[model samples]
Target: TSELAAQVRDAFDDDRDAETFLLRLERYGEDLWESLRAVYGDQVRALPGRLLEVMLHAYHARPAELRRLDEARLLRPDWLQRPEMVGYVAYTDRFAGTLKGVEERLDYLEGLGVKYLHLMPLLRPREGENDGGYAVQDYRAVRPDLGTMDDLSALARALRGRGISLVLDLVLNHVAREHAWAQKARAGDPKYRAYFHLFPDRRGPDAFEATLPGNFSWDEEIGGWVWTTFNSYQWDLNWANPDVFLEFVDIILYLANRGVEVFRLDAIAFIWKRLGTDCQNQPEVHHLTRALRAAARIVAPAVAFKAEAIVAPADLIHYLGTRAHHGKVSDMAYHNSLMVQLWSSLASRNTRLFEEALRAFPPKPTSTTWGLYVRCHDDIGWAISDEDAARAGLNGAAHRHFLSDFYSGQFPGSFARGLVFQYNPVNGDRRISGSAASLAGLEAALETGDPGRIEDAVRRLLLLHTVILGFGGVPLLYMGDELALLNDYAFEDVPEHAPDNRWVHRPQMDWALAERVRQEPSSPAGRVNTGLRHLLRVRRDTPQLHASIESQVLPSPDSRALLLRRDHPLGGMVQVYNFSEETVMLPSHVLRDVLGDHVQDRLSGSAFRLDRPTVRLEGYRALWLTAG
Candidate 1:
């Protein structure tokens, strides 16, 4: 400890000066110290000095251009929270053939008003079954097929020039079994073996399995049961080891130096494990995240973290840090419950459940915001709670089961066409997998060849986007959702993607179809594309839609309409969505109270007066009402 402490002191002593470097340390030093001590305890002597070394390395290694970005972000700390900010996420391979291909498509992305682009896991992974690149084999290298690290750096630079932030995935919880560390551990190296959780037999695993879910995988080469949370090839990293902490910090700084602005922390909830708990969303996870964030702030103030914790609403808020941690952990977290509720309301055509669920959520810290979305690359799980549903006068289990059946086309008169993913037969837990458009009825409606149903589906698609866009966060638009791409069942034909139904939604970008939509505004694809584009433009121009505003889920007079009211000092917005197949009406007073006597529907630029007794919304219509 003394030797390492001296090394750390020397590193900092060599670089410490009276300017930006020292000032950042002064502002964030205590946070770094507290979080490190929380995770490492007395085991880490002089941990602050050691972390200062990391910060200085990142600071010095940072390119001159990025250092300017860091200072600029410090000037405007809430840049990402602006309403003008919109996100688009996609697989690097699917969106484009490679990193260079993605670079070539920047024009298309910018044309859609995307300011933040999250390229799903382009990191190098194991040869086969990489768990969609979550099983990272190397953090420093790019996947060979996707070009090189230089290519990624170039893409990041290109995106920055276009005023778009580059978001990459950092798989914090686990690594591929083929990773160098994992391979070294497999080779019976005691030092590297401690980097992972390996049990000699079922004794330790069985004890933890009593309270924790089993993520065990039989490793023939090592003759042990290894911790593989998502798949057999993915080995869980041991965060209990201080070396692992330093390793990831180094990786983050390395990527930061490469121009990556945001890191999507993959499976962060499972980073820390406990024997007597579910081993997800543990308290230690927050401490580690805080330390990581503080470290980044010291050198790369522009860098942000997005937590991928798909837990309950109560547990979910903790990832963003509350009470003691308040706004000190990750900058953003996935509002998974909101996504689940959106689908739930659409299926039931009732806003009571969605309203109740939103009201139940603990208010997030204003410093951090949600990464709101209608759908993403993963499957949709019904995350409704019994208490929330009971408030809406519905049984939780029955509703969840009904949603599974409804989306899977098992329910009579169901318009959705989706496949069930990861169905746990023992517990009857089911999740749905399909593109946003397909799950929203575009596929089924098109299959029917009915004009009325087709139009309704397009309306439903845009309506979902409307909620997310004005939902007071960074609204993430999935790659194909803008063009209303349906499920590509041809995933079953591929040997690698056959078993995982999630690939059904992971379709390649149809450039030809996209161009057609851009050319013909009346076509089905064009309708969805144009409608979403209009919403994006409106969202950008509206200051009331900023993420800092207080968003309240107001009780609607009409059960078929979902009402969201956002208020800021500058102005206010009242967004109404009609989810049913029939027209819905709310008393004019309801709109008047929120937006005053005269309101303009931002979506359609139409003026309506509260003098009218009722405010009517046709089937599947979404209105963004605002006062001048």
Candidate 2:
């Protein structure tokens, strides 16, 4: 311990900002050491000093401008949680063709009030079947077809200048089989072979396969069953290896030096594997994440970590840390349960399950927040557990089955136009893949040429966004959702993307359609664009919408309406939405008690008086009411 401490001190001796570096090390060093030790056991005894050496090099290599950002973030640690902050995500190729193209669209992003821009999987991946860029071949290289790493760095600087943070995905769980390390390991390098979970035979794989689900993929070249949780080309990294941990530390600092502000740690739940278990959401995963976070803090305090674990609400909170590791792990995590419940309530037109599911989650620590969204670059799994469903007096299995049928346009009177993805024939479990607009009935309504149905679809679209924006977290709008882009059936044409239904929602950016919205405000696309912009404006101006405040899902007196209440010292807000396609009446006393007799709807300029015995909400209407 003394030798390691002396090495850390000596490494920073010649630095001018040694005290600043030492101070951060002092605060997080022990936690980092303990976390690494917990993950690597005795193998990491000498890792602390080596890790500090990496931090020292990264601190020196950090750009002068980014160093200022680090200090500014230190002064205002909760800046990312501000209400004015909004997020948008898209594929680099689909959104703009390239990184340089993305730089050109900065004005459009700013116009949409986006303060955080998440470019999905810009890193270079294998030539074919790259799992939508999740299978990274090279961590430091940008996709050659997209742009160079220099272009990425230039865009990062430009985004920083615009008061926007650049977010990139770091696939921590696995790497492409074509990666240099994977190649070395396959070529019989004993040291590098330890980097991945490779087996010379099926004996080791067969035993684990007894209890664990099949994560194996055949590799003709390697002639072995490699661990591929998602696909064959993506081999799982061995986090149990101390060298692997140190390698990621260097990789993270390398990206941080390039001005990347936030990293969405991809597939974080499956990072650690066990022989007799499902190998997900393991305790060692959190420990390794803490070590990674602590390493980043010592050099780049401005950067943040977002865990991409889409588990149940009970297990999801652990990624953000619990009482034992409060605020020590990832700064953010996907509020996946909330998203699933939103879609569930929309299809069921009932708030009972939504209310019950939300109530099941304990309050998240204030220091950490959720990354709330309606949809993203992935398929939506009906993640509702049978236990939580039964608590709401609904059959878990049957309700999930119902949702799958409803969203895929299989149920009677279904309006959603979505395709089923990854249907598990064994268990009859299926996930849905479609754009928010298409799944919300816009495409079906347009096909029918029914004006009333189209209006209802537009209302549903806006209603979902209202909740996500009002929900206390960073509201991430998937690409083209603001303009109400529908699912593209053309994905079938591309052999590479033909098998993945998720590409259905990942349509190319339509600037021509975006321009039409400005020319015609009442058009279908115009209504969605204008409606979203208004909500963004309102959210930015409302301090109560800040993620620091706690939001509670309240039981509505009327089953057709879902109520979410946000309380703050400045003021409190009551957001109500009618999920049904018919007018619903709520007792006037309920609104009067929370929002007083008279209140103004922030979304609409209209004022409401709760003097009457009942408060009426139009079909699919959402009201953001503030006390007057």
Candidate 3:
């Protein structure tokens, strides 16, 4: 106990402004001690002081401004699960010219009813081939191409004033080979060399590669195997080292101090590596995450970590921390299963596999929830339930291939306009890329000018959003998704971004169309934006849309539609989605009991009679029914 107290004292002794530092440091230490003691018992007695020493290093490393932000976030831990927490994410250079430009568009965001916004990787990176800003060179500095560090904080503060939360990516797995530490290490600087995993040659790299899954393909020609997780340029960080652990905590603390409310912890699965194993979702990885969370709890308790683990369902849920257990590693995780399953249903038109996967999902903690979205900036990876696929008498690889081809418009009669991404030759696995509107058939509708097809496309977009919004979590909207924006092919011309097909959906904001919708209100973009605004309004105002609320999937009598009944405070809301090209009849008996009087459609001002045997749905139409 004396040794532990000394370590804590040593950790805080550097604080010249002891008043503020002691107050925050004590709260952080106390908060972490309780949780750590609960988890480890007597074993924790020695750890509290050591952990505080590590945490003090992290807190001091954080910028002075972010410290204040961390202090505030610790006060409100459950901010991510709020019903009105609608998030929109985009790249700074892609969405607007700079950080200041993004500030100018806050009114546009507020108009669309967004409460949280994610600015994708605004950090400085290698001049070219930066992996869409994922290969971070500097953790504290903003890219000159975007703006200064001051501009970013100013923008965060401005957004907060308007009731908006700013989210940034903490690309945790690796850094650019051109980074200062990486450069020094490459130049044989012994002390900085220890910061990363370096081998004398391919011998050590090949040995590690033997047990580990190949992260990147051999096309880059790094001569023998390198530790390329996402790409050869982005080297995987060695999390096994305590120095790396402290480095990331400092980064998180820095961001929290900078007023970043939510952190999208990128590539969280690949953090822990082991020999002769997949090196993903390892037990030690969870422990390391808990340690990082402990560091966050100390200074920036209000800031939340959202894990970017696009892995299996079982492994994915573990990041959100178990309800039966205390002190979750991440507050939220990307619902990769649900997102991939939605695309699968689009291809097969069968909900059995989808339903089966959900039935097996373990209940999440009341304090935490999923960050649900139909589309994001990255390419869509197929992370399906292999066991369920086998049970359904389907080959996992071939089905995923078919879905990829279908979405890329290779399959005949497919109503999608997507592109192929990272085609791996070994297993023939690939990912899909396109905007929500393009993949849902809206781009095709606009090209052909078919009203029926256009309506269906719009319905598909709304239906997908409905699931994310009502399915008990924060619903994220990809930038330009609100206005039903189509994929931009112009990205292929840019030398820096053209190699990646994900840039196809990363389109610039067409505020002209947004203005047209806001004024004339009759154009398709206008109508789609208006319809989405209504959905946001309804979602926010309705108390039933809150997280952890009971919601069940129901069988829709119409083969083209999917039905779900959400038990809300104002009775249950029955959600129906029409996936077909023609009008389908809803079985009146299914919804008649809960829906009294006229059933109001939230998207369109359509009314339904509970007494009628059929509820008519035009092609690609969706209806959310609440009792009048």
Candidate 4:
């Protein structure tokens, strides 16, 4: 113990490596120490001693430059929120062909105001049945098809040079069956056996499944019962085992050292388990997350953890580390409720229901934040509240059915072109999959080649992002969405991917389209790209558009629009959205009290006419008005 302490202390004392390692620990390891104390306080008398051993090992494995990143991250804890922070997420090969190809597009991303680039899961996985690279075989190595570890590091360095933060999926929940630990466990290796949740027969697992709700679309009988949340091949990690906790910690720190500034903790709800309990949002899961946060604090504090739990608003806020009667949870969580409700408002042309649902969720803690996005890599699940649905005069089950049907083009007069994902026949519940453009009506317009409708579709896309980006939190942009990439439709032919409807929206970066964007400004490819650029510019430049310090939902005098306003120290900004496909008229005097001064449109650079009192907004059009 003394020897280990001495070596760790020396590493910590070295000014060069000390600050670097400390920074990484700070960004990546928040709350890890406190959680560790709660979880393993009795087991280890010398808490610092065990930690020292871990740090020493990590220091030896980490390279010198990454040590520098650790130091840099420590100095800039707010690196994730810098005004220059632009983000894009995409498939590694699909976007750039390889990691090197991603490197080549750094200039393009920079041009598009992207300062943070998320390469969706480039890790090695099973040859077949890999869930779009979400199933991990090796955490440390990049997929050979994408490139080598060297290529990944080089890409990170190049992006960093251009002031872009590299984000990636940690895929913390599960690994492919072909993973080394799984392979060894299947071969009956006792040492590796502890790495996963394996059952001798199926009695215990089945009993547990009885209590846990199924998260998967297709069900498979495992041990004579349904045992899958996502895919059967993707085994859930058992956090009850201390060994599993330690191993994942090691992997997280390793990635932190590799310059992954933001880690999207995939499917965070399924990380822990217990029999006769709904395995999602279990108390033990929060403890495990806190422990992970504490570990990052002890090693690399600069790394940010984004919780990917797609549960209800009340349950989802738990991931933001809000104190329940039990304890705290994640540092950040996805604003899934807001996302779903936005679409809800779009479908019903009403905001009262959405407003009522959002009000039920208390404000998140200051230390944590929310990741708001209109659409991402996967399908849209209908996880709404039945009580709220009833209050809104909507049939909960029927509304969900309507949304699924409407988005998948099953509903008459629907302009959306989405595919159905995981439709459960018993309940008629289903998830919708398509790019923001496709699901929002752009794809249908492109198919018909209707220029006016295409323009409306572009407005819809911008309107969605306007709400997410202007809301008080971190806003995420799905890669290629900026260019209005529609459903690829090619995945249906690929044997390996056909089963998953999510691939409909996960299209490869059409380099040809990308090139055309450069040459033709009026092309469909160019219009979406240019529209996004305009929005990004407005968001970056407008002080009122930046994530506000305080935000709240305000009632619009007009029944036709949903209204939200943010209070800035100097003045304020009010956002108005017309939810329907008809013009909404609101008197300007109605907003005067909220505006505090004359209001100007951030997007159009035009002063709003207050004397007219009557303000007209086109259907589905949103406006961000700031007092000047």
Give the Cα error of residue 562 in candidate 2, in Å: 0.7
Model 3 lDDT, full chain set: 0.74
Per-residue error for 357 in candidate 1, Å, reads 0.5
Q: Is candidate 3 or candidate 4 better by TM-score?
A: 4
* Segments in model 4 whose C-alpha atoms lie over 4 Å from true places: 1-7, 10-33, 44-48, 60-72, 186-189, 198-203, 214-232, 324-331, 447-450, 545-550
Clashes by residue pair, model 2:
none
TM-score of candidate 4 on Cα atoms, chains taken together: 0.89
- Using TM-score as the yardstick, the better of models 2 and 3 is 2
Q: What is the lDDT of residue 181 in candidate 4?
A: 76
lDDT: which is higher, 1 or 3?
1
Q: lDDT, candidate 1, residue 67?
A: 84
What TM-score does each of the candidates earn? 0.95, 0.95, 0.85, 0.89
lDDT of each: 0.87, 0.87, 0.74, 0.73
Please provide, for model 2 over 112-159, each residue's C-alpha lDDT reduced to its tens digit, 9 standing for 90 to 100: 899999998888898987877898999999889899999999999889
TM-score of model number 1: 0.95
- For 371-488, candidate 4 gives per-residue lDDT tens digits of 7788888789987788888876778898888889888898997878888888797998988888888888888887888888888777778778777767766677897777788888
lDDT score of residue 578 within candidate 4: 84
